[PDB]
Structure formats: C-alpha cells, structure tokens
Amino acid sequence: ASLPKAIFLMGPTASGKTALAIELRKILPVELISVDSALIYKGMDIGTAKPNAEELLAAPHRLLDIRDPSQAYSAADFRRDALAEMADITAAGRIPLLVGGTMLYFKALLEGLSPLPSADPEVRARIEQQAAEQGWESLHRQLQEVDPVAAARIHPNDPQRLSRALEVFFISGKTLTELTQTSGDALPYQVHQFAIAPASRELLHQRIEQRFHQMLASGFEAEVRALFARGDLHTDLPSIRCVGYRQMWSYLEGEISYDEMVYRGVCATRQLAKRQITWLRGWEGVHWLDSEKPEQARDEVLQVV
Amino acid sequence: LPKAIFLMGPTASGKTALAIELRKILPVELISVDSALIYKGMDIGTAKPNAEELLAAPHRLLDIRDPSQAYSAADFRRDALAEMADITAAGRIPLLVGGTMLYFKALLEGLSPLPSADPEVRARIEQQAAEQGWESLHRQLQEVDPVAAARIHPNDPQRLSRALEVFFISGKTLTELTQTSGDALPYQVHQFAIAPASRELLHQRIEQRFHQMLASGFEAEVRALFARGDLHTDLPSIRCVGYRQMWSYLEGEISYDEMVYRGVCATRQLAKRQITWLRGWEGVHWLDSEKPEQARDEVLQVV
RNA sequence: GCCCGGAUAGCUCAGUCGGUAGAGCAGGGGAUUGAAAAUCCCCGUGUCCUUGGUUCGAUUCCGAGUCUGGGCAC
RNA sequence: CGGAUAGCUCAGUCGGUAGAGCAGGGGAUUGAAAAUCCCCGUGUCCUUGGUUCGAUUCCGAGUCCGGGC
Ligand SMILES: [Ca+2]
Ligand SMILES: [Ca+2]
Ligand SMILES: [Ca+2]
Ligand SMILES: [Ca+2]
Ligand SMILES: [Ca+2]
Ligand SMILES: [Ca+2]
Ligand SMILES: [Ca+2]
Ligand SMILES: [Ca+2]
Ligand SMILES: [Ca+2]
Ligand SMILES: [Ca+2]
Ligand SMILES: [Ca+2]
Ligand SMILES: [Ca+2]
Ligand SMILES: [Ca+2]
Ligand SMILES: [Ca+2]
Ligand SMILES: [Ca+2]
Ligand SMILES: [Ca+2]
Ligand SMILES: [Ca+2]
Ligand SMILES: [Ca+2]
Ligand SMILES: [Ca+2]
Ligand SMILES: [Ca+2]
Ligand SMILES: [Ca+2]
Ligand SMILES: [Ca+2]
C-alpha cells in the first residue's frame, strides 16, 4: 500500500511562502491549499497578504474566502476541510501542497485531534460571567477539583484554555484529560515538510517593517474602515484580533494615534513571526529553505521530492 | 466689584473636565463661550458635553440657536452679561468656559457700538466684488477711511466687507465709530489658559478626538442637517470644523479619506489660532492640560 | 534675552525622606487539543546628562553648565 | 521605455548646495471668529564609481518603484 504524498510549505509571515508555492505550481503537479486562520475571511485581503486575482488564476488556492469575518473557524474545521480537499486533489492525480503560517492547523492535520465538544456560546458566556464576579482564579480552582492534570498544565492567567477545559466538562460530564487519552488519527499521507525563512533574525524584522508600510500604502486603512463601518464586528472576534486589523481597530476607535498604530502593528507582526519560528524549531522532519534565495529553494524542494 | 472666572483653552484641552471638577468645590455656575455649541443638534462634532456631564454641571448658552441663524460676538456679550447678572444676583460666581477667544475679548473689553449685519447691503458688496474684484472695494474704502484701509488687507473679504458695510448703512466710517469704546466688564475677572505641554501632544489628542467622534455617529448627525434642505456653506454653523468637510463628503465633492484628512487639519489649525490668541493675553495664568490635579489646585488658590 | 519645568533601561516614565534602582512597552527563550495572526509562562540591559559644594557616602539636597519643552518679552 | 530632490504630490539646477501647492510653524483679530486673512521656511537631491577646480545635475553600474512581451 503506497501512501499518497503531500507537501507542507510552512514558514513565518513575510518569508515568501506564497511566492515559492506559485513557482512550485509551474513545475510540480500540485494543487495548493491555504493553511492560514486569516486568509479564510472575505474582505480581509490587504492586511492578510492574500494572493490577488491574477496570482489565483495562475495558481488556485483552496480554503480562501470561505468565511465572513463575523464567523469563527477552528483547527478542527480546517482539518475536516483540508482532509476533504486532499482527497479530491489526490483523486485527480495531483499532489496537495499545503502552504501557510498557521502551525496549529498543520499540527492538527498531521497528528490528529482528539474528539471533543465544539464551542458553546452560552456555556462560554456563563464562565465569562463567573470570571467577572470571582476572577479567573476561582475558575482555575474549580478545574483543580474536577481535572487536576489539566489544572497543572494550564496557567491561572490563561483565560482561553481555562475556559476551554471547564467548557468540555460542563457539556459532557467528562474531563479534558479523560477525553484526550483517546488519541488523534495520524495523517495517512507520506508528507514532505519544508519551512522557508530569512537567513537571520535581523532581517526577518526588516522585511516585516517594509511589508507593513507597503500595506499601509495599499489602502489597508480603507479595508478596515469598511469592516469598522458594518457595525456588528468587535474585538472578541478572531478576525478583528488579527495582526494589523486589531491595531487599526484601536486607531479607528480613536484609542491610539496613527503613529502608535503603526508602531503596535509592526510589533504585533514581529511577535507573530517569533511564535511561528518557535513552532518550527521544535518541529520534526523540517527541511530548511532560505527566503532570500528562491531559486535554490525551488530546486531543493524538487530534489527532496 | 463682583468676581468672575475665565477658563479658556484650545480644543481637546480638558476644559469641561476641569469645569465639572471646579463645580464641586467653589460656588460657581458655568457659561459656555463657544461659537458652535450654541447650535441645536450639533453635539458630536462640536465636542458638546454629554447629557451626563450636563446633569453634574449645568452649562448656560448651549443649544439656544437653530443652525440657520447667525450668532455674533455682540449677541454673546448681551447674553453672557444677562446670565452673569442672574448668577450674581443668586449668590454664585460665573465661570465662563470655552475656546472662542474673540467672544471672551468682546465681553471683557467691550465692543464699540456699530450697526449689525444688513444682508441686502452684504448682497450688493458681494455682487460688486464679483463684477469688479476685491481691490476696487478696498480702493473705495481707502478713499473714505484711510485708517481701516491700511489695517484691512485687500485679500480679507470679511473685514473689508464689514468696514464698507458700516459706512454704507451709517455714512459714518468705521474709524469714526470705533472711537467710542466699551462697556468693559463691571467684574473682577480671573483669567486662566489651559493647554497641553507640547504642540505634538496637542496634535495627537486632536487626531484621536476626531476619530472618536466619527466612531460615535458624527456622519449620521451631519446627514440629518444635510437632510433639511435649507442649510448652506455660507452659514456659520456649516463652516465649523468637521461639519464643513463632512458637508463636501455628503455633496459628493470629496472622498471619505479626504474628509477625515481635511477635518483633522482644520482642527489642528483651529487649536493653533486659539493658543495664538492666548499668548500675550493680559493677566492670564497658564495651566497644564495633562496634570488635572495640579490644574484645579492653582485655580482654587488664585481666586 | 528673562522666568518655570524636564533630563534615570532600546522607548515612555516611576522612584530613591542621602546608602549607586524598577514598572509598562520593545527585545529574547518557551508553552500550545474546536478563538492559534489567539491566549499565556519565564529572562534581560543603567557612565541615573556634565561639573562643583555639603557629606563617611550624592542619581537624589544645593549652585553652576548643556540639551529639550513651555511661558513672558520682541 | 520611464520615475528616485522638503512630512506628502511634484518643479528645478545650460555643472557653482534648490522652490510651488498641501501639511507644518509665527502673526493679525470690533456684530460671520470653529470665521477671514498675512508672513516663514522646512534638504546625506537613493547608493556607488567615471569625467570635473566643482556633479544632486552630464555618463556608467548597482537598488527600489510603476508601467510595456
Ligand atoms: Ca497673541
Ligand atoms: Ca502681546
Ligand atoms: Ca541612553
Ligand atoms: Ca528616554
Ligand atoms: Ca522623573
Ligand atoms: Ca534610604
Ligand atoms: Ca515582550
Ligand atoms: Ca568631596
Ligand atoms: Ca555628584
Ligand atoms: Ca543633579
Ligand atoms: Ca518655545
Ligand atoms: Ca516624495
Ligand atoms: Ca522630477
Ligand atoms: Ca547654473
Ligand atoms: Ca530654499
Ligand atoms: Ca499652511
Ligand atoms: Ca481689535
Ligand atoms: Ca531652515
Ligand atoms: Ca556624485
Ligand atoms: Ca545621478
Ligand atoms: Ca515591472
Ligand atoms: Ca498590456
């Protein structure tokens, strides 16, 4: 049984992932899938570094523009959509090339996800209510009583995972620990994994500052103003929490100056890149490609496949 | 001589913030000194104190005029005097707060008795000037009043028109009439200027405050005024900062990004002229905007 | 020119009743199970502007100098 | 094929260190004042070589742009 093959092209923001995948498209029989939590949103184009129409004509990207910014996506939704796209592409005699910087998604796809309940807004509101009356420390104390192992790993000041560990208990009566000893299904594909990134760190920062000011001149403020104008989007939504968009949101709310927006936008982008690189340093199977050398990058992929 | 307080400062200075904190300590009644806050239904764009601030502190001379009605420094003078007389006859001290320095000037020093606007006579001067240019009218003024001709520049249509208007209605020239004076205040006044530490900080708070009001439904407000059908660019209300730019946006003359840019610029420039007024103002005590604690304390002492 | 204030970490600034210092932000490392561009954890780095006076000891109090921001004067 | 000069859009130096609008700064202010006016400039002329007493300018070469196959 020959396991079908796929390629992961990962990397930080401003690393030229999109550039290289579109070049790979010309010489390898591949179909591209976006692995990015922000490129999935309609009308969020400039700030997300979405490939434009002409780039999509030459190299179609699946899993772009499948959500309105008011709606939320998940590692799980990605996994289900990604698996289903990977079966079509394979059934057409092609090789799925998955490209993006959203590393939890790659991980969810590669090693599985344990089956668990999905979000419950009502249960989430309840927990948020109690945090506001008694602090998150009371909630972490509750988790100590029901799920000691989850309590130890999850820090008292991590609202997101604290809410998540309790939620799973409230919905099903079983603890997060209990459910996650059932393991995720591994990806039934032979996968070649690459991570392309700038030679050094000083240079990663330089390209990020450049790519931010590039966006500003591309009409980024206008894009975010349209979103801002709708009236039904708010900073608790994943899309508005995106890098660039969140700081521009403060700006449009009159909470910071233009220069403070610019400062905090770039910083958030550097902070993104840094966390993407952390994932990649601990990742297993990675072939490293040099961002500032796209020609060798292309040839290195070719001769590893 | 009964006493009074001037609290003067540029836009985005925390005037109202301080006024409401003074109202808790000294026995005092606020009077708004502002060419724009007089107008009904112009609330967001003008930085009008909200209905909550108005409950803590009553402000007089707010929302006394429909936007189709021109106010004037003389109308302010009459109303402020009449209101000071109530506050004084009621045991309290008038605290006039705001950023319209000509209005403060007229009140303290007095205006000389002249004729008011005659719109027909203004119609003829604006008609003559379109046919014969603004130099010929200036020439006309030099022939009959040399002194104002030397002071009023040929490219200043408002003051030139006014100088000629005073003569056309009266027969007496502006110089002749401005020889009689005010009518200064019969009050012992304590004058305060409240401004930020630096010009960069003032600019930055101005940008911020303008985006604040956009996000609070400023365009909807101006849409309502635009809805009416009787208001136009020659009215004092629609020439206000923010409102005038939003007016061009609503006429389809400029984009939204352009409206925002010109609005911020127009508000920076307003603030600049406001502190030009205050620099050199006699007897004024300066206060820092960013130090509200130290601010309040200096006022309490001086009085 | 005169008067007032500021000067301390890569940035904003707190503080040291005179015993040579710490917050946020930036930067570094790490965690990561249906919000992940999210949410968290851990770690840095000082001629305390210069100089003189008082002092056992001064970044701190005092004087002077320099740079910066205001006001006043033109 | 083109463009790179002020915070922004740009003009200009027949080779001798540069203006225009806008922004910005200073000023005036007598019934429209959030109005109406007046005054002032903001400089590694992208980098590097060549030619030159002198190059931002002329001529190469680099780099970034925006356009044409
Ligand atoms: Ca003055
Ligand atoms: Ca003066
Ligand atoms: Ca230093
Ligand atoms: Ca500093
Ligand atoms: Ca300090
Ligand atoms: Ca001590
Ligand atoms: Ca940090
Ligand atoms: Ca000594
Ligand atoms: Ca010393
Ligand atoms: Ca000292
Ligand atoms: Ca100064
Ligand atoms: Ca330019
Ligand atoms: Ca040119
Ligand atoms: Ca010449
Ligand atoms: Ca010049
Ligand atoms: Ca100007
Ligand atoms: Ca006068
Ligand atoms: Ca100069
Ligand atoms: Ca040269
Ligand atoms: Ca050249
Ligand atoms: Ca091209
Ligand atoms: Ca073409």
Whether the Cβ atoms of residue A267 and residue A258 lie closer than 8 Å to each other: no
Show the tokens assigned to B227: 């809805």
CA–CA distance, B229 with A62 (Å, rounded to integer): 51
Cβ of A302: how many Cβ atoms within 10 Å? Answer: 11
Tell me whether residues B207 and A258 touch, CB distance under 8 A. Answer: yes
Whether the Cβ atoms of residue B160 and residue B134 lie closer than 8 Å to each other: yes
Nearest-CA distance B204 → chain A (Å): 6
CA–CA distance, A153 with A137 (Å, rounded to integer): 15
Pairing of strands A190-197, A30-34: unpaired
Whether the Cβ atoms of residue B191 and residue B299 lie closer than 8 Å to each other: no
CA–CA distance, B293 with A300 (Å, rounded to integer): 66
Q: In chain B, whose CA is at the least distance from the CA of A231?
A: B215
Alpha helices (runs of H) in B3-118, residue ranges in sequence order? 15-22, 53-56, 73-89, 101-109
Asked if A179 has any chain B CB less than 8 Å from its own CB, the reply is no
Whether the Cβ atoms of residue B22 and residue B28 lie closer than 8 Å to each other: yes
Q: Which amino acid is at A177?
A: T
Tokens 């635009």 found at: B226
Q: What is the DSSP letter of B210?
A: H
**Nearest nucleic acid nucleotide to B199, CA to C1' distance:** C69
Q: CB-CB: which of B207, B214, B257 is closest to A257?
A: B207
Whether the Cβ atoms of residue B95 and residue B28 lie closer than 8 Å to each other: yes
Q: In chain B, whose CA is at the least distance from the CA of A219?
A: B257
Nearest-CA distance B154 → chain A (Å): 40
Whether the Cβ atoms of residue B292 and residue B21 lie closer than 8 Å to each other: yes
CA–CA distance, B20 with B17 (Å, rounded to integer): 6
Asked if strand C comes closer than 7 Å to A101 Cβ, the answer is yes
CA–CA distance, B189 with B123 (Å, rounded to integer): 40
Whether the Cβ atoms of residue B265 and residue B245 lie closer than 8 Å to each other: no
Q: Could you write out the three-class secondary structure of chain A?
A: CCCCEEEEEECCCCCCHHHHHHHHHHHCCEEEEECCCCCCECCCCCCCCCCCHHHHHHCCEECCCCECCCCCCCHHHHHHHHHHHHHHHHHCCCEEEEEECCHHHHHHHHCCCCCCCCCCHHHHHHHHHHHHHHHHHHHHHHHHHHCHHHHHHCCCCCHHHHHHHHHHHHHHCCCHHHHHCCCCCCCCCEEEEEEEECCCHHHHHHHHHHHHHHHHHCCHHHHHHHHHHHCCCCCCCCCCCCCCHHHHHHHHHCCCCHHHHHHHHHHHHHHHHHHHHHHHHCCCCCEEEECCCHHHHHHHHHCCC
Residue among B3, B49, B6, B2 nearest B299 (CA): B6
Starting at the edge strand found earlier in the chain, the sheet holding A95-100 runs A61-62, A30-34, A95-100, A5-10, A190-197, A287-290
Q: Which fold has domain B2-110+183-303?
A: Rossmann fold (3.40.50)
Whether the Cβ atoms of residue B193 and residue B8 lie closer than 8 Å to each other: yes
CA–CA distance, A116 with A178 (Å, rounded to integer): 10
CA–CA distance, B186 with A214 (Å, rounded to integer): 62
Q: How far is the CA of B197 from the centre of ligand 9 (A)?
A: 30
Residue B40's SS3 state is coil
Tokens 């409230």 found at: A170
C-alpha neighbours within 13 Å on the C-beta side of residue B287 = 28
Q: How far is the CA of B269 from the centre of ligand 16 (A)?
A: 9
Q: How far is the CA of A238 from the centre of ligand 8 (A)?
A: 63
Q: Which amino acid is at A158?
A: D
Q: Which amino acid is at A129?
A: Q
In terms of Cβ atoms closer than 10 Å to its own Cβ (0-12, 13-18, 19+), residue B284 is: middle
Show the tokens assigned to B52: 């909550």
Q: Would the CA dihedral through B249, B255, B260, B264 be positive or negative?
A: negative
Mark the breaks in chain A: residue after which each occurs, C to N over 2.5 Å: none
Q: B91 to each of A84, B21, B33, how far by Cα in Å? A: 81, 19, 21
Whether the Cβ atoms of residue B72 and residue B39 lie closer than 8 Å to each other: no
CA–CA distance, A299 with A196 (Å, rounded to integer): 13
**CATH superfamily to which A4-112+185-305 belongs:** P-loop containing nucleotide triphosphate hydrolases (3.40.50.300)
Resolution for this model in angstroms, one decimal place?
Answer: 2.5
Which residues, in sequence order, are bridge partners of residue B43?
A: none
Tokens 């719109």 found at: B119
Residue among A53, A55, A103 nearest A78 (CA): A103
Residue B205's SS3 state is helix
Report the first-to-last Cα separation within chain A, whole angstroms: 19
Q: Which of A224, A227, A247, A258 to mutate to test the interface with B (most CBs of B within 10 A)?
A: A258
CA–CA distance, B236 with B39 (Å, rounded to integer): 10
Here the contacts of A261-265 (C-beta below 8 Å, separation 24 or greater) are A262/A212, A262/A213, A262/A216, A265/A212
CA–CA distance, B81 with B2 (Å, rounded to integer): 13
Q: In chain A, whose CA is at the least distance from the CA of B210?
A: A254
Answer whether the bond into residue A290 is a cis peptide, omega within 30°.
no
Where exactly are the structural domains of chain B? 2-110+183-303, 111-182
Whether the Cβ atoms of residue B93 and residue B300 lie closer than 8 Å to each other: no
